[PDB]
Design a protein around this ligand. Structure first.
Ligand SMILES: Nc1ncnc2c1ncn2[C@@H]1O[C@H](COP(=O)(O)OP(=O)(O)OP(=O)(O)O)[C@@H](O)[C@H]1O
Ligand SMILES: Nc1ncnc2c1ncn2[C@@H]1O[C@H](COP(=O)(O)OP(=O)(O)OP(=O)(O)O)[C@@H](O)[C@H]1O
Ligand SMILES: Cc1cn([C@H]2C[C@H](O)[C@@H](COP(=O)(O)OP(=O)(O)OP(=O)(O)O)O2)c(=O)[nH]c1=O
Ligand SMILES: [Mg+2]
Ligand SMILES: [Mg+2]
Ligand SMILES: [Mn+2]
Ligand SMILES: [Mn+2]
Ligand SMILES: [Mn+2]
Ligand SMILES: [Mn+2]
Lengths: 683, 289, 289, 683
């Protein structure tokens, strides 16, 4: 066993009844003085390194050609001047195993952390040396972390796409289904997770040109998509991951759910395609009143009204659907469907739950389209227009397929540096650059939506780490007050940066004029309610930083009205799974699953303590499963009120609790304004 | 945790003797020496005689005393393979290679042979000693069964595999390989049923059952060494056959959840080439907060 | 004069329920009334019970007492079919058509149903009464087995056949026809073994054996009438099924070498409408013509 | 039980030790007295019938509008003047259950046999009343039978395409694979059987964008295609049928074959995807000499030579591939592979066998392309060019995808009417019309090849029926003499009609000038070898008909040289599954499987004796399984020497014969010039 492995395992060997957390630090030293420094490839100077990486097809030469070598040297020197040290063994291990650039045979390490950060910063700046240094300082301080696609692939010749998630709308036609399968394979080839809205597809037993009971429903398309994602599995490196979203009022909703039952037959079971359910407020109202609900056949509704079932408001059209004899429907028990959802989430963690009305009551771009589904991580909530892929030799009507670039603020590092504004603006600029340089030649709706919406996702990580390292319980009202203030600041500065980009470029996102940003409605709660901290401890935490007031929000509203906004969507809180290790941060705004996690790598086992875990903050690092899910819902709703897109909200459940407890948590989330629920992980 | 999985593997391995044409073996059989032909005949008769005991007694007696419908079905399937498939396959090989009078004489010889009889009767004795509702006696019989399936057959399988790995007697070698593949899964399955009984016992009773298993293994092993020299010295193979016996003894022990008894040895390369959360209804007022 | 041809017929009839895809019955099942679905589930559950005991107990015990390796191989194969193929196929049907709770309920229903318990008690009692080397106890159990194969299954078989005949539940019906094809040959074979024993007796003993067979048939028949009414009254078919079971009772008697006991009747014409390769290597001379 | 079913089952009841065959005739009468006439919709006049069928969207207005009502009435009167009577119950049952037009509620019969024949004739003639009457006389004499798609769908508004055999070339790219899946779905939606060539696809473990061990091979593509064919199943009417062809020198050939093994796992086995193997002469030579063969990685060959492995002649390329270090290959035993093919055919009848050199040594259009694969029925053998389907908003390079037009001559009816020439020419004209009226808007290469090649398949059926009713054993040399003469006349008149159509329209098929028809090579064996019958009995059979001599063939060769040929391909012998029942004929040129076949429909049992079966010809109606497969191969080769495309050739084996016998039959077929082997049906 390696020396650093033994040093890391020495953490759990208690001394005087206490964990040896400091041993972890020793491990990193070993991991660098025995493996990383020996396995790294050193050159005489930076010129030889850059030339070797360029000619050997490791780096794209275009982004490096925008800078003179003196500027690149200055950027690299700025990166190395911080003398960044990984405080935990797992941070360095995760970076050098998942994100550091290696040779073709993967026998040596070509990129250090500073090298990777410098390359990403130079790609972000697009020829601006000062901007590149700003990005270097932002990432080496670990205030901002680009998503895994962006951080791993920026400036690389053998790179994939920098966009993490893609959302596709599938129209009810064989041509559209085949095009959706093709685009899903193309985007999984690019490495991104693909989500498909199957609510427009007509249910099982519908007519294909006057021959009835002919359609296979959404389950056949689900099987096709599952095989497509199995085939396109990132060249066999990462398993192809897809998501299917169906409205709960679709007739196939049961069969949909039956794809995830552990007793499902092979002709129905789907195993590589995640499932999500979109629940309008009408379904929750029907379940609450115990009135029997009706699921609908989408094609009959489309024939009668000319629009898809998910294209209009069910809260106002459900009674018209039910009373219409030309609309076909089936009777269901909404409470039984809710119990089935809870049982399925207990068994397998599926489906994702999207509260459609919670998303669309604060959605700023309802004029473009209502949000009808979410992404594979159930945090992207954007307007999408379905595409009409016609026959060959016929022009296709290209719609809008959602796609946003992810980037997370490290809350602990951002607040320690007292740089919410600067970090938010620089992250917005980096995400705007990632969107601008993204061009996908096989997904036309994705390309058009990227060019028009200009949507980005700016997330946050290390919420629980910051709260526990500052002596604040994650479930406490003080923690929710901190989240309210911090994310109001993040939203304020993201809107300010979006408006500044719109002013400097003279262009807004497409159809911005009909948005609530243009009409000023979006700023209502920000121009009437003060989001400054209500607790003295939180206010002290925010000292040295100008917390925006109602007057600052009014000025920002006027600025947006004058100049517009460059981005249709700005903030989305992704799960941030593996890149949180490198940043020494807790995953996303979720509470920690465990204080010390035991992970098996190779034939060895490693223990990763939570960042900053110690004796004095052991009980502030409360495990998520031990927490009240209602207070976690309260925290997520408090954050969500300042996030325009959704938050990947994983439910952390105990084995003792029943499906009724899961249903109660889901209904409280819906009541509190939670937009989406990601996972039901049971301990 | 395992019966449905073994059901699947068993039924998908189904085969019939008629599938392999045997006549083309006569083209290599005619080129073997008298000692090679003699050893082959004797080994074949040994396997045939032991497998008949397993079909008539071993599998059906275990199926009788084991509780569980699905286990009884798997065990019935295994008994069927012994009686309907394996027994016919051995007969077919014999009828192809030897005339009727030669077959009768070889079986007369092997029937009187001291080392074959010793092991055959030791195994049969344990099957006859099973008592209704006594899981200890059932376990002892299961140990005997695993030793037959995963260990005792292999002093015999060696020779057909040795020829098969050299390009000789390929049709009968293919048949033997299919038989052996069935006995392997039979041994693993019965082994899991024995471990289930073993795990229900006290620590003292466990130690006592371990001593039983090791003592039985020792008796059978010492007789296998004699059986081996008796058959294989005339063709110069006994040293390598002994390594193969020990290697398979270790597999049999592992099937019973026990540690290997013998040190690891390499095997003859020619033979190697041959080889649910609680559902609680919503009570209303869960929609109000 | 017959075992070899039965051996060949049994092994050539080998099948698994997984060969038949069942999702095609989903719609014709959905369309049946609640009464029809209830009767159908219960009917197949009654069949499952019979095959469970025929596979676990009946066929293995008869195999144990019948002399001759080939006769034993046929009986062992038939036993495997009962519990590894037939009994399991019903679960394949249940798992396709019904939710788990309905499946759980029907298996609970077999345990508490008095007619199904009575018929199992009677048949299994006779199997377990067989005494070694006592041909009369063996004959009695073989009569019981023929009555199970050729008479008792038929109150159950009626309904899948009745649907198959109307073009309904045809995949499930295909499974049932394969099961029925097997039971027909099983009933003939066991019948021939029973006749062997009967033919050894004095005329006085034969007269007693006929009394036993007829008394047993009548006792089983009277119980089957009540079972039939209990299941079929809710679907309006009891009288029709009764005619069918009498028809098959005569076939069971004939399988035993006895004259028909019930008068002929017109059976529902819908129900009548409801009714690896050997490998050789390539020679160099096979490439030239 | 209905009366006609009792009269049909009375056939098996033997009177005086003989089957009551004549009772079948009575059954037909009952089937018409009790059922057909009662459930046939009758109208006061044909005008009312046509108006009702057109208005209720049963027929098409376009093809009926080309004639005055007087001409349509005259065509219908010509059809009804024959007073055609079905000679067997199964003929009428199959027509009125499969082909007769029924109401939307499927309880009444709108079309009789004469009505359907008249409608198909009017569709064929395209406005010519005399041509329509000629077609009516052709089909009511039952001399020619349009295929099931053409016969069922001609003149019907609610219909699929008239072509059901489609051959697709799949290029080695994700875009091309997705396009192939889409086209397969679209063509299965149209009701056609789709065959895909997978030899150009790179094997498992190949590089994608210079990353190693990334390709899933052709098995993942087969899984995708199998899912696509399961999804597209003719609106839930028939099971989606597809075929995949792989060259035997493709490395995936074992895994390909492993998709049909019973022991294969669920992630390996494809259930609704037929498989065929293309066997070049090089593989047969390697197996014959027992030399170990090499299966090659297609992408390495493409990188080294710039052409696909299946696009070059393996006979001259195999040694260069083996000796090339940059071509990756795996060692195999060709005899073991042949034994595996024989074993798989014994178990399941798969794969289809295509002898590439047997096809291409007589292929007339090798300049366009060599025949690389066959159809789902393994009788279509045409040149195909792969298409380069690029990314979106990029022009695709459309190639040639085979789609031939099926139609079968009834040899008994054709020869008893002494009308080989007239029937062949009229069938060629009808096939040309159906090919010209086919327009598929979702298969670009299929449409392009249909427009360019103008390939049709004119088959024959009732060969064994005709031979048995004339006292000729199917295996006799007289039967082969008759087949030789009859199919040489069929080829002569097909070529003459193609040249006449080319002269009339002034156009040939694309790239005809490079074909062997243009160079006169095709006619070589016809201008030197006389194909007149060598037996007096066969000559008396051909009495009253002019048999083309060598001088006639020289004149035809000169005519083709002067005027060209309209069709790239003319003759292919399809299995003719259900149309053989309606025509009261034996299926294809195959020998009969059973003298009397027992079938189970709904409730009933039914009995179909072979056409013309009696006590006198009971011995001549020998079953196919009892026949010597070498003599069947000899007859099929005798026919194949006059057929430009292939013949659906099913092997009929007994359970006693082993895989050595199957391999011997395959090798004798290869030796005798058999192009394709369809199925290995074991009795
Ligand atoms: N935790 C760590 N994170 C990142 N790099 C590390 C870490 N530990 C060691 N290294 C690398 O290994 C080298 C070993 O030097 P070490 O940290 O022991 O101190 P040093 O030799 O006094 O110099 P310095 O600390 O100034 O780099 C470091 O210079 C650095 O490049
Ligand atoms: N074998 C058959 N094939 C086809 N149609 C038949 C057949 N038998 C009867 N029919 C149909 O039933 C009708 C009655 O025919 P039948 O044998 O009674 O005498 P017919 O002289 O042909 O009668 P019609 O006055 O109808 O012409 C026929 O006209 C035809 O439409
Ligand atoms: C072709 C086909 C379609 N479908 C379903 C899936 C699609 O969402 C739906 C629409 O198919 P379409 O491609 O729209 O078929 P269509 O346009 O010819 O019919 P229509 O005019 O009614 O739109 O039909 C199947 O389920 N199976 C099939 O094989
Ligand atoms: Mg459509
Ligand atoms: Mg490519
Ligand atoms: Mn055995
Ligand atoms: Mn065994
Ligand atoms: Mn049974
Ligand atoms: Mn039975």
């Amino acid at each position: 066993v390696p020396k650093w492995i033994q040093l890391n395992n020495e953490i759990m060997i208690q001394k005087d009844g206490k964990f040896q957390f400091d041993k972890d630090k020793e491990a990193v030293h070993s991991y660098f003085v025995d493996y990383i420094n020996q396995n790294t490839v050193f050159f005489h100077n930076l010129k030889e390194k850059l030339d070797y990486l360029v000619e050997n097809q490791y780096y794209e030469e275009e982004f490096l050609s925008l800078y003179s070598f003196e500027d690149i040297k200055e950027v690299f020197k700025t990166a190395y001047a911080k003398k960044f040290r990984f405080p935990s063994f797992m941070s360095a291990f995760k970076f050098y195993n998942d994100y550091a650039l290696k040779t073709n045979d993967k026998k040596k390490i070509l990129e250090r952390y500073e090298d990777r950060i410098s390359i990403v910063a130079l790609f972000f700046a697009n020829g601006d040396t000062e901007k590149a240094k700003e990005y270097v300082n932002l990432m080496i301080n670990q205030e901002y972390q680009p998503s895994t696609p962006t951080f791993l692939n920026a400036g690389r010749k053998r790179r994939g796409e920098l966009v993490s998630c893609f959302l596709l709308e599938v129209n009810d036609s064989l041509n559209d289904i085949s095009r959706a399968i093709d685009i899903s394979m193309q985007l999984s080839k690019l490495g991104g997770g693909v989500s498909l809205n199957l609510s427009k597809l007509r249910a099982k037993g519908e007519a294909i040109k006057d021959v009835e009971n002919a359609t296979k429903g959404v389950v056949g398309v689900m099987k096709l998509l599952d095989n497509a994602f199995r085939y396109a599995d990132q060249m066999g490196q990462r398993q192809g991951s897809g998501a299917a979203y169906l409205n709960i009022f679709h007739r196939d909703i049961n069969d949909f759910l039956d794809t995830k039952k552990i007793s499902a037959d092979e002709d129905v079971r789907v195993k590589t395609l995640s499932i999500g359910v979109v629940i309008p407020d009408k379904f929750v109202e029907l379940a609450r009143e115990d009135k029997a609900a009706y699921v609908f056949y989408p094609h009959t509704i489309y024939k009668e009204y000319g629009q898809h079932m998910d294209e209009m408001d069910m809260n106002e059209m459900y009674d018209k659907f039910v009373d219409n004899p030309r609309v076909k429907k089936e009777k269901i028990n909404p409470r039984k469907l809710l119990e089935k959802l809870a049982m399925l989430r207990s068994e397998s963690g599926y489906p994702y739950i999207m509260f459609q009305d919670n998303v669309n009551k604060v959605h700023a771009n309802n004029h473009i389209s209502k949000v009808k589904f979410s992404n594979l991580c159930s945090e992207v909530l954007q307007a999408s227009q379905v595409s009409s892929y016609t026959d060959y030799d016929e022009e296709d009507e290209i719609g809008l397929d959602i796609s946003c670039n992810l980037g997370s603020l490290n809350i602990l590092n951002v607040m320690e540096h007292k740089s919410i504004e600067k970090t938010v603006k620089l992250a917005t600029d980096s995400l705007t650059h990632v969107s601008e340089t993204t061009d996908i030649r096989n997904a036309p709706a994705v390309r058009r939506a990227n060019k028009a919406m200009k949507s980005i996702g700016l997330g946050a990580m290390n919420l629980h780490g910051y709260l526990a390292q500052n002596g604040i319980a994650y479930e406490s009202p003080e923690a929710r007050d901190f989240a309210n203030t911090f994310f109001m600041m993040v939203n304020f500065y993201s809107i300010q940066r979006s408006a500044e980009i719109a002013k400097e470029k003279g262009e807004t996102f497409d159809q911005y004029e009909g948005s609530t940003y243009a009409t000023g409605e979006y700023f209502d709660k920000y121009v009437s309610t003060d989001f400054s901290p209500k607790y003295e401890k939180i206010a002290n935490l925010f000292e040295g930083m100008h917390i925006p007031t109602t007057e600052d929000w009014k000025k920002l509203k006027a600025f947006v009205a004058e100049h517009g906004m460059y981005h249709s969507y700005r903030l989305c809180i992704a799960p941030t799974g593996s890149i949180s290790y490198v940043q020494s941060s807790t995953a996303s705004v979720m509470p920690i699953m465990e204080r010390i996690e035991e992970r098996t790598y190779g034939n060895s086992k490693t223990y990763y303590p939570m960042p900053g875990l110690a004796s004095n903050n052991w009980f502030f690092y409360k495990e998520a499963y031990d927490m009240d899910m209602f207070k976690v819902v309260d925290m997520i709703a408090t954050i969500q009120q300042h996030i325009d897109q959704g938050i990947s909200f994983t439910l952390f459940l105990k084995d003792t609790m029943t499906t009724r407890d899961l249903n109660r948590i889901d209904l409280y989330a819906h009541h509190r304004g939670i937009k989406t629920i990601y996972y039901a992980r049971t301990k | 945790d395992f019966t449905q999985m073994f059901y699947n593997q068993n039924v998908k391995q189904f085969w019939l003797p008629e599938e392999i044409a045997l006549n083309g073996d006569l083209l290599t059989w005619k080129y073997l020496g008298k000692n090679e032909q003699d050893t082959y005949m004797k080994v074949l008769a040994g396997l045939t005689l032991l497998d008949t005991e397993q079909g008539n007694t071993g599998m059906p007696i275990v199926a009788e005393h084991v509780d569980g419908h699905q286990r009884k079905a798997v065990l019935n399937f295994m008994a069927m393979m012994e009686n309907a498939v394996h027994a016919k396959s051995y007969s077919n090989i014999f009828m192809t290679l030897a005339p009727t009078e030669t077959i009768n004489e070889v079986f007369e010889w092997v029937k009187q042979n001291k080392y074959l009889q010793k092991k055959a009767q030791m195994i049969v004795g344990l099957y006859k000693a099973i008592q209704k509702d006594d899981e200890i006696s059932l376990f002892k019989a299961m140990v005997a069964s695993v030793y037959l399936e995963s260990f005792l057959f292999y002093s015999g399988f060696y020779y057909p595999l040795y020829f098969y790995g050299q390009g000789k007697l390929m049709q009968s070698g293919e048949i033997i390989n299919l038989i052996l593949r069935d006995e392997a899964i039979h041994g693993v399955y019965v082994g899991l049923l024995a471990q289930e009984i073993y795990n229900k016992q006290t620590e003292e009773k466990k130690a006592e059952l371990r001593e039983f298993a090791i003592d039985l293994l020792n008796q059978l092993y010492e007789n296998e060494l004699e059986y081996t020299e008796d058959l294989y010295d005339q063709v110069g193979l006994s040293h390598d056959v002994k390594k193969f016996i020990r290697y398979n003894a270790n597999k049999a022990l592992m099937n019973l959840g026990f540690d290997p008894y013998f040190e690891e040895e390499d095997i003859n390369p020619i033979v190697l080439n041959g080889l649910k959360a609680t559902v609680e209804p919503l009570k209303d007022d869960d929609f109000y907060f």
